[PDB]
Design a binder for this molecule. Structure first.
Ligand code: CL
Ligand code: CL
Ligand code: CL
Ligand code: CL
Ligand code: NH4
Ligand code: NH4
Lengths: 121, 123, 123, 121
């Protein structure tokens, strides 16, 4: 819990997430997706709540990735919100929101929602 | 545009968002919330997509706030996903997810969803 | 209250919702949308929780619309989840999920989320 | 696809869903949950899109359950949106919204979001 977040994680789609959790709640790393208008690693930044409760709970965290890198600009950003749980098999369970930049005309259809489970396997 | 996003913003609940959009697509600042087990400012970090399109599309962005500071710890974190629309009345329209740390058993009810609109006042 | 919900309602996009709240907690009616691969009325079915609280809480409800009628088929369905707030200006505030049928491969991008507010005009 | 929706399904939590899909898009049945202020079966009603595409896609559908029965009234309603996919192992993959009736003061925190995968196993 708290700790253990640092490392390389993978989700059901094959995307890889490499993060560093800092003593004071920062989350920094890079994201390589398996889907979308993605081509390479993207920078990610987030926060995690460094003093989780001392009961059998997971650690809340969230992060963002703007899908723009030296290779692609998909004019969109994804944020994942979820919680980290450790143990023999640690995972991060998240729900995400992906918003694309649209014209007002298409604003009603700008956000996709999904879920992802990351493991270090 | 980074500038365009930089500034002080408020939403309909009365929360304050102070942000700096940096060259490299980063977003840093503090969030003051009007609701929840919150007290004072909290640090936020996000990213925004620095090269939007010409046209009249919004700039997609997103940021996270873990509700822990030196005064409180709510054991939860919210991420806001949305777009910035500039003009005379610049607005950031978002959808957010708030997750609380829970035991595996109550995990099914760990995330809330909602939407917020922010109006800019200062740079 | 069933009555209270029964009526003609419009949201900010210009879509029409005609509903009948029945005794047994059911919701039946037609939806006319202003956006999407939609043409004409579609059938909706939902439920609402017939015994709310006294107090000034909203009545939780929800309904589904599969976007297929005799004129079009969009292979998608939307569910709206929210609450009814009565008074002189009765409103139904919702959050919706729109899922499109896709291949397993593009399933990750099958659902859109958003929010709608409905204003009542007729019973 | 289209067909096959009728039957008894179960989700990862143990909730049971029994539905009847009608030739014209109606979904009717009852829901027995494993979690919440639930006590027994609840009536559910929904719709499904009866003419799915003739390509390897799933069938879109959605349904609602107001958590009020002769035994409990949890002043809330849940709607599930997702798609049915058949094959040797058929499943219904959904994302749900659960709204409780609150005072305006608490309206900002009235909706929970999650996901559920139902199988006939
Ligand atoms: Cl991904
Ligand atoms: Cl807020
Ligand atoms: Cl609509
Ligand atoms: Cl359930
Ligand atoms: N993703
Ligand atoms: N559920």
């Amino acid at each position: 819990a708290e700790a253990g977040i640092t490392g390389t994680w993978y989700n059901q789609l094959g995307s890889t997430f490499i993060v560093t959790a800092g003593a004071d709640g920062a989350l920094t790393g890079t994201y390589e997706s398996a889907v979308g208008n993605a081509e390479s690693r993207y920078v990610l930044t987030g926060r995690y709540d460094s003093a989780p409760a001392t009961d059998g709970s997971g650690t809340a965290l969230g992060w963002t990735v703007a899908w723009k890198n030296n290779y692609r600009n998909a004019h969109s950003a994804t944020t994942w919100s979820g919680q980290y749980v450790g143990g023999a098999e640690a995972r991060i369970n998240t729900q995400w929101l992906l918003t694309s930049g649209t014209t007002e005309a298409n604003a009603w259809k700008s956000t996709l929602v999904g879920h992802d489970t990351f493991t270090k396997v």
